[model samples]
Structures are given as C-alpha cells and as structure tokens.
Target: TLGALEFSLLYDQDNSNLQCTIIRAKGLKPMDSNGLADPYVKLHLLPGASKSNKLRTKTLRNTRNPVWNETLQYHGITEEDMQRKTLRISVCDEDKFGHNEFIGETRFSLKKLKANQRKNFNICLERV
Candidate 1:
C-alpha cells in the first residue's frame, strides 16, 4: 500500500457542480531536512481537462499528516461528463524555493461514483 489519502466526494443533483472534501491524508514521508515536510493535495479532472479542474488543497503547518479540512467544488459537471472522467490526485511536499518535491500520485475513475451519495476516498497513492 502507498500513501493513504482521504477525501469526501459528493455529487449534487440540484446543482451542476460537484462538492468534494479533503478530510485528511497520512502515510506521508519527509522530503526536506526539517524531518517533517508540509505537503499539499491537488486534484485534476481528466478526459477533457479543464482549467476549472485545477482544484488543490493547502497546508499551513509542517505536519506529517495533512489534515486539509476543506471543500472544493467543480462547476458545469453533468452525468455525461462524468463518464470516462478521472480524478488525478497528487501529493507533494512544499519547498521554500522552486517547485518542491512530488511524493505520490493516483488515478481514480469518476464513472464509479454515485449521484447524491457522499463517498470517502481512501485510495493508495504511488510514491515518488
């Protein structure tokens, strides 16, 4: 098993947008000399990638466990668009300068998602 990243995904039947929450993530490794690196999670929607799919999570402190308790919504989403779509989730440790370090990544299919059902994303991420 890789990094155990957790997220809460829910689709809205009334609205055209989908709501998702990054509850918390663990099994992260240190990349900096601090022995504890601040990591962030980024989500991308594929099968026709859009700038709107550039949703990401932010970390404030240097905790090995990234508890990103925040919600991100993607608009203009339809049931047809959900087909053949994928969620590209990424995990990276922050750096003072430049693009820091990338640690984990995974691809999750959106076709398996159910409408109006809040699902937990507890997937395995490949390490760098």
Candidate 2:
C-alpha cells in the first residue's frame, strides 16, 4: 500500500469523525495488457467482525497514474473505537462485465493516529 499511492488523513476527535482524502497514485503497474488501467480506490474498516462500510472513489480512465481529489468520512467513531480499528484501502482496475482486478492494497491503524493531525503518506500496491 505504500509503494505508489499517496493519501492523507485528518481526524476530528471532538466530532468523532475521521476524514480520509485520496490524493493520487503514481507508477501503478498496468493490469490491462493492451491499454492503461482505469483505476479506482476501495476503502474499508479492518476486522470484518467489527464494522462494514466499503467506500469508494470514482474511477479514473486510461492512466497508470491517477488523481482523485476525493474525501471520505467515517462518522460516530468514538475514541475507544478508533483504538481498535484499522483502515484498509485497495486500488483496483474497473471491469465492465466480470469481476474487477486488484492492483494493490495497504492498511493503517487508527489507534496510532493523532487527533487533529494531517499527514501525507505514500503506499504501494500488493499484487494479486
């Protein structure tokens, strides 16, 4: 997850919200053999037993390097819950009919995140 993609985080402790902003990715290996990939992002909370919300960014067409000025939010996450949660983000190639292809994924721990802090981070894709 830390190889090519870059993202940022901003936590609002007082409001019990976590904001995830997807900036862009660079040098993504192409999933398509003929053309560049149509890249998109998928996000989730780790530990399937704890919670479930699959948020996504719009697909960017025909490029290995994609930029998405997208912001996703998690609400009602209390301090106690943040300590027990991990955020999982994956980059995928869009498919018209069949299942989409996975490019790579990375995850981060909310427990270690500092409140009111914003940090720019880069992640690499894990080949499937």
Candidate 3:
C-alpha cells in the first residue's frame, strides 16, 4: 500500500517492550474536585489457548494510574510452553462520581510467540 502523501505507520514487535500509560486525566492524583475522571483499572491474564496454561489475574480496585506490566513473562508464560496462546489484557472503571458500575472496558491480545530456548523481554511500567 502506497500513498502520494500523508501516510501512517505502525510498529509491531514479537517481543514488544512497551510501557503503556493508563491516564486518569483529571483524577490522576487524589483530588477533591468534582466532575473529574477517576479510573479504577483491573488487569487479567486468563487461561490461554493451550491446555496446560493456567489463569492469572490482578486487580486494582480504585486508583489513579494502576500500572500493569504486560510482557511474555508475567503470565508464567513462554513461547514453547504451548503450541498456541492468547493473553488478554483488559481495563474497566468509572468515568464519573457515584459510578460504582464500570463505565468502560477494552482488551488486547498477546499473539502466539515463536518457539525459542529463551526470549528475554524487559518491559517496565511505572507510575510517577
């Protein structure tokens, strides 16, 4: 695909060491102000497509920026551990006050990795 001008590009890595920031815009920090976003993030790594793989889950009930390290290792996962696998990372939270109910949710996949003796992926996620 080619364009005369104004083209967009995307980068995909098998071992994507990325620090994804989940921002709580107005409510990033503790505040007394009203009508501000206060997101409570929850991350889950459910059982993969493989038989032996087990489920892994982590939850941050109420927080500003709940950091979750997404990588090939966190899930006790590896390339050769399974013939195929799909790790799902999802987020849910309140967008307004008195919103005990979750307002939104989004999930992404960590595709099946190629088999290797070892694949060291150094990913870091910090809130500061």
Candidate 4:
C-alpha cells in the first residue's frame, strides 16, 4: 500500500501566512535492510521550488509510523498566490550509510483553505 501522512493546515489572513503542522505519518515503507527506516518529512511550494522556503521535520529512527508535531510556516503568502500555489509534502527515508530516498508524497492546493481556519488532513502519499 502507498503511505499515508497526516498533517494540518491553517491560513492566516492578518499577515497572509500559510501554516502547516506536521502531525504524523503511517504505513510507510522501509528503505533499510533492517526492515525499518529512518524517516522524515519535507515540504516545498510548487511553481518555484525555493530552498529558503523548504521545511523539514525531525527524523524518526527505525519506524514505520512517525509522530512529528512540528509546524512549518510560509510567510508573505499573498491572496493571489493562494489560487496559483500548490504545496508539496514529501515523505523521505534518511539512510545512515547512503542516500536519502523518497518514500512518497502528497500535494494540496492552497486555494482549498479558508481564512484563519485550521483543517485536519489525512492524505495518501502518491508517487509522481
């Protein structure tokens, strides 16, 4: 089965910010030979993937389910950007001896969010 990730989102209108809270992830696959993985989560905005805008969660060692309650915020989000922007949330496996491989990812349109309302989401990770 494809992995599943649970995160939350909040859109603030006062300063036009997008807040993403990385809750946890479930059903992830192992990338290590030990039948487990060291996993973390990554976030970026599409159209122009800027490194300054990239956010990452803490890595959980040897886990299929990781609970990281970190929140990543995007400042200076304009109203015009909301309709044109898409958020890319990726789950990655951090290897101790090799490359960090991508497990799966989930995408969301910022236009679906309302002003100042927090939304809980459980989205299935899909390969692109």
Q: How many residue pairs clash in each candidate?
A: 0, 7, 0, 0
Better model by lDDT: candidate 1 vs candidate 3: 1
Candidate 4's C-alpha runs over 4 A off are: 32-36
Colliding residue pairs in candidate 1 = none
Candidate 3 residue runs with Cα over 4 Å from true position: 1-37, 48-75, 80-84, 94-100, 112-128
Worst 10 residues of 1 by lDDT: 29-38
Candidate 2: worst-modelled 10 consecutive residues by lDDT:
45-54
How do all models score by TM-score?
0.86, 0.87, 0.32, 0.90
lDDT of 2 by residue, 1-128 (tens): 22498999888899988899999999887555744478889988865454446788989988788999899888887787688878889988887653577788888898888999887787676754
Candidate 1 segments whose C-alpha is farther than 4 A from its true place: 32-36
Better of 1 and 3 by TM-score: 1
TM-score of 3: 0.32
| Clash-forming residue pairs, model 4 | none
Instruction: Indicate the residue-level lDDT of 41 in model 1.
Output: 80
The local distance difference test score of each candidate is 0.77, 0.81, 0.33, 0.85
Ten residues in sequence with the least summed lDDT for candidate 3: 1-10
lDDT of 1 at 99: 63
Model 1 TM-score (2 dp): 0.86
